[PDB]
Nucleic acid binder design. Structure first.
Length: 108
DNA sequence: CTCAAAAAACATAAAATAAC
DNA sequence: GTTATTTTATGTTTTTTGAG
Protein backbone atom coordinates (compact mmCIF):
# COMPACT_ATOMS: atom_id res chain seq x y z
CA UNK A 1 0.00 0.00 0.00
CA UNK A 2 1.22 3.48 -0.91
CA UNK A 3 1.03 6.60 1.30
CA UNK A 4 1.00 10.23 0.25
CA UNK A 5 2.82 12.38 2.78
CA UNK A 6 2.16 16.14 3.14
CA UNK A 7 0.69 16.06 -0.40
CA UNK A 8 4.35 15.91 -1.46
CA UNK A 9 5.93 12.48 -1.25
CA UNK A 10 4.66 9.09 -2.39
CA UNK A 11 5.93 6.41 -0.05
CA UNK A 12 5.84 2.66 -0.75
CA UNK A 13 6.87 0.52 2.20
CA UNK A 14 6.88 -2.65 0.09
CA UNK A 15 9.36 -1.43 -2.53
CA UNK A 16 10.89 1.03 0.02
CA UNK A 17 10.59 3.99 -2.27
CA UNK A 18 10.00 7.67 -1.79
CA UNK A 19 8.99 9.89 -4.67
CA UNK A 20 8.80 13.68 -4.61
CA UNK A 21 5.97 14.94 -6.77
CA UNK A 22 8.37 17.63 -8.21
CA UNK A 23 10.39 14.77 -9.89
CA UNK A 24 9.61 12.74 -13.07
CA UNK A 25 12.78 10.59 -12.95
CA UNK A 26 14.20 10.53 -9.42
CA UNK A 27 13.11 7.62 -7.10
CA UNK A 28 14.58 7.87 -3.58
CA UNK A 29 15.52 4.39 -2.39
CA UNK A 30 15.01 4.40 1.40
CA UNK A 31 17.17 2.20 3.53
CA UNK A 32 15.33 -0.60 5.38
CA UNK A 33 15.40 1.17 8.78
CA UNK A 34 14.15 4.47 7.33
CA UNK A 35 11.39 2.75 5.40
CA UNK A 36 10.15 0.73 8.42
CA UNK A 37 10.19 3.86 10.64
CA UNK A 38 8.15 5.77 8.04
CA UNK A 39 5.79 2.86 7.66
CA UNK A 40 4.97 2.61 11.36
CA UNK A 41 4.64 6.43 11.54
CA UNK A 42 2.29 6.52 8.53
CA UNK A 43 0.13 3.66 9.99
CA UNK A 44 -0.34 5.79 13.08
CA UNK A 45 -0.53 9.35 11.88
CA UNK A 46 -0.11 12.09 14.45
CA UNK A 47 0.33 9.58 17.30
CA UNK A 48 3.32 9.90 19.62
CA UNK A 49 5.10 6.62 18.83
CA UNK A 50 7.40 5.44 21.62
CA UNK A 51 11.05 4.66 21.05
CA UNK A 52 10.48 1.09 22.18
CA UNK A 53 7.76 0.72 19.61
CA UNK A 54 9.96 2.01 16.77
CA UNK A 55 12.89 -0.09 18.04
CA UNK A 56 10.71 -3.21 18.12
CA UNK A 57 9.02 -2.58 14.73
CA UNK A 58 12.18 -1.65 12.90
CA UNK A 59 14.72 -4.06 14.44
CA UNK A 60 13.72 -6.47 17.26
CA UNK A 61 10.63 -8.09 15.82
CA UNK A 62 12.98 -9.25 13.01
CA UNK A 63 15.69 -10.52 15.39
CA UNK A 64 17.99 -7.54 14.89
CA UNK A 65 19.90 -6.33 17.99
CA UNK A 66 21.08 -2.72 17.96
CA UNK A 67 21.52 0.11 20.48
CA UNK A 68 19.00 2.94 20.86
CA UNK A 69 21.54 5.16 19.02
CA UNK A 70 20.43 3.31 15.74
CA UNK A 71 16.89 4.76 16.08
CA UNK A 72 18.21 8.27 16.51
CA UNK A 73 20.59 7.86 13.56
CA UNK A 74 17.87 6.39 11.31
CA UNK A 75 15.47 9.29 12.18
CA UNK A 76 18.16 11.80 11.18
CA UNK A 77 18.75 9.99 7.80
CA UNK A 78 14.98 9.87 7.18
CA UNK A 79 14.51 13.55 7.99
CA UNK A 80 17.36 14.29 5.53
CA UNK A 81 15.62 12.26 2.81
CA UNK A 82 12.39 14.09 3.50
CA UNK A 83 14.16 17.49 3.70
CA UNK A 84 12.58 17.75 7.13
CA UNK A 85 14.14 20.36 9.39
CA UNK A 86 14.61 19.38 13.05
CA UNK A 87 12.81 22.46 14.43
CA UNK A 88 10.55 23.40 12.64
CA UNK A 89 9.55 20.02 11.25
CA UNK A 90 6.83 19.43 8.72
CA UNK A 91 7.07 15.65 8.83
CA UNK A 92 8.50 14.15 12.06
CA UNK A 93 8.40 15.87 15.41
CA UNK A 94 10.53 14.71 18.37
CA UNK A 95 8.67 14.36 21.72
CA UNK A 96 11.39 14.24 24.28
CA UNK A 97 11.30 11.23 26.59
CA UNK A 98 8.35 9.84 24.62
CA UNK A 99 9.39 9.18 20.98
CA UNK A 100 8.39 10.76 17.67
CA UNK A 101 5.23 11.84 15.94
CA UNK A 102 4.32 12.09 12.25
CA UNK A 103 2.67 15.55 11.84
CA UNK A 104 2.48 15.41 7.98
CA UNK A 105 -0.85 14.57 6.39
CA UNK A 106 -1.11 10.91 5.44
CA UNK A 107 -3.44 9.95 2.58
CA UNK A 108 -3.69 6.32 1.62
C1' DC B 1 9.40 28.99 44.35
C1' DT B 2 12.85 30.46 40.74
C1' DC B 3 16.32 29.70 37.83
C1' DA B 4 21.42 28.24 37.23
C1' DA B 5 23.89 24.23 36.82
C1' DA B 6 24.05 19.45 36.28
C1' DA B 7 22.36 15.52 34.02
C1' DA B 8 19.84 13.34 30.49
C1' DA B 9 18.05 13.08 25.88
C1' DC B 10 18.36 13.85 21.14
C1' DA B 11 21.02 15.28 16.42
C1' DT B 12 24.72 15.29 13.15
C1' DA B 13 29.52 14.17 11.74
C1' DA B 14 32.89 10.64 11.39
C1' DA B 15 34.51 6.08 11.91
C1' DA B 16 33.98 1.10 12.21
C1' DT B 17 32.09 -2.97 10.77
C1' DA B 18 30.31 -6.53 7.80
C1' DA B 19 29.19 -8.60 3.64
C1' DC B 20 28.61 -8.11 -1.19
C1' DG C 1 37.25 -1.71 -2.83
C1' DT C 2 32.31 -0.20 -2.34
C1' DT C 3 28.15 0.35 0.12
C1' DA C 4 24.66 -0.44 3.91
C1' DT C 5 24.38 -0.63 8.63
C1' DT C 6 25.89 0.16 13.19
C1' DT C 7 28.46 2.51 16.42
C1' DT C 8 31.32 6.25 18.30
C1' DA C 9 32.64 11.18 18.88
C1' DT C 10 31.11 15.60 19.18
C1' DG C 11 27.50 19.01 19.21
C1' DT C 12 22.69 20.86 20.62
C1' DT C 13 18.49 20.84 23.24
C1' DT C 14 15.51 19.45 27.06
C1' DT C 15 14.78 18.10 31.65
C1' DT C 16 15.77 17.36 36.37
C1' DT C 17 17.76 18.98 40.72
C1' DG C 18 18.45 21.89 44.50
C1' DA C 19 20.54 26.05 46.64
C1' DG C 20 19.52 30.74 47.38
Amino acid sequence: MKFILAEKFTFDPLSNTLIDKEDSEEIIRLGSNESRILWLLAQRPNEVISRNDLHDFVWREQGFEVDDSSLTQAISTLRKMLKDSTKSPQYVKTVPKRGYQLIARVET
